[PDB]
Design a protein around this ligand. Structure first.
Ligand code: ZN
Length: 303
């Protein structure tokens, strides 16, 4: 059962997929599993929908693991999923959110890369699509979005860690989300979960242009980082992607914000470089707990 699932360890693709089914079976009135596409290598791509009813209620999107080696993100996603089912009907604030809004949680946004990190190369980041005119495999799926696609802050070199791919939305892992979010039409928040650096970022990455909602998103981010820090003292920086970390093009929240999804944020979770992508399992639960406080704060602002 999800009560005996080990949240303090890293899991395989199959384990996470089986966890999804267990959670849905345990909480059939709250959680359902949606297949939003198939990966390049034909694996199902799944989103958990948390809902207490209604018809396409205002929604929060959360993607985790788009960069496959960022294992703290999938592990955080699993914890989030369980936490949602525990706190609905117990925590006043979260209960208020789910009574009026739906949450769509994509724990393994890049399943082919995730499988590869378990079977072949722990440090695999990209998708597994094969570039026809190339010995190289995969695209940086967080540089493949139709937001400043192909502009400075991504690489045109197919072997690069930061390769943007041949055209915007070339990667089915990205296009699956784009289609789902567009078809849905009522997303109000869009949160992309990454590691590492301890940053909470709002748009843009591709341009120095200030978003029209900068004052608001900046204060939301300030509040969220304070909430996150309150638990273990984990210090996050916050601001626009381009001012806070680097220019980066073809990114998820730049795309979502340009669709009119106002509360668009990217979290870069622990740490700041000591372990980097190889974050010890002993930090999974503390990371998930503090990150939840930040995420819940954003959801509260979305209302
Ligand atoms: Zn990342």
């Amino acid at each position: 059962s999800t009560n005996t699932f080990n949240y303090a360890t890293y899991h395989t693709l199959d384990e996470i997929y089986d966890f999804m089914d267990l959670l849905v079976a345990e909480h059939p009135q709250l959680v359902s599993k949606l297949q939003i596409g198939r990966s390049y290598e034909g694996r199902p791509i799944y989103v958990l929908k948390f809902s207490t009813g209604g018809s396409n209620r205002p929604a929060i999107w959360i993607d985790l693991g788009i960069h496959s080696r960022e294992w703290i993100t999938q592990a955080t996603g699993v914890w989030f999923a369980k936490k949602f089912t525990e706190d609905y009907g117990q925590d006043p604030s979260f209960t208020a959110i789910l009574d009026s809004m739906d949450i769509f949680l994509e724990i393994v946004t890049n399943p082919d890369g995730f499988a590869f990190t378990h079977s072949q190369n722990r440090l695999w980041r990209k998708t597994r699509s094969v570039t026809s005119s190339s010995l190289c495999v995969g695209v940086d799926a967080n540089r493949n979005w139709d937001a400043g696609f192909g502009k400075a802050g991504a690489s045109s070199s197919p072997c690069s860690e930061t390769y943007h791919g041949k055209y915007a939305n070339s990667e089915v892992e990205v296009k699956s989300i784009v289609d789902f979010v567009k078809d849905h039409g009522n997303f109000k928040a869009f949160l992309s979960i990454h590691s590492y650096s301890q940053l909470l970022l709002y748009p843009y990455g591709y341009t120095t242009q200030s978003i029209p909602d900068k004052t608001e998103l900046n204060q939301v981010a300030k509040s969220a980082v304070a909430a996150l820090k309150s638990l273990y003292g984990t210090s996050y920086k916050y601001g626009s992607i381009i001012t806070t970390i680097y220019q980066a093009s073809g990114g998820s929240i730049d795309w979502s914000y340009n669709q009119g999804i106002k509360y668009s944020f990217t979290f870069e979770l622990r740490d700041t470089g000591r372990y980097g992508f190889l974050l010890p399992a002993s930090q999974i639960i503390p990371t998930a707990q503090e990150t939840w406080l930040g995420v819940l704060t954003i959801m509260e602002h979305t209302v």
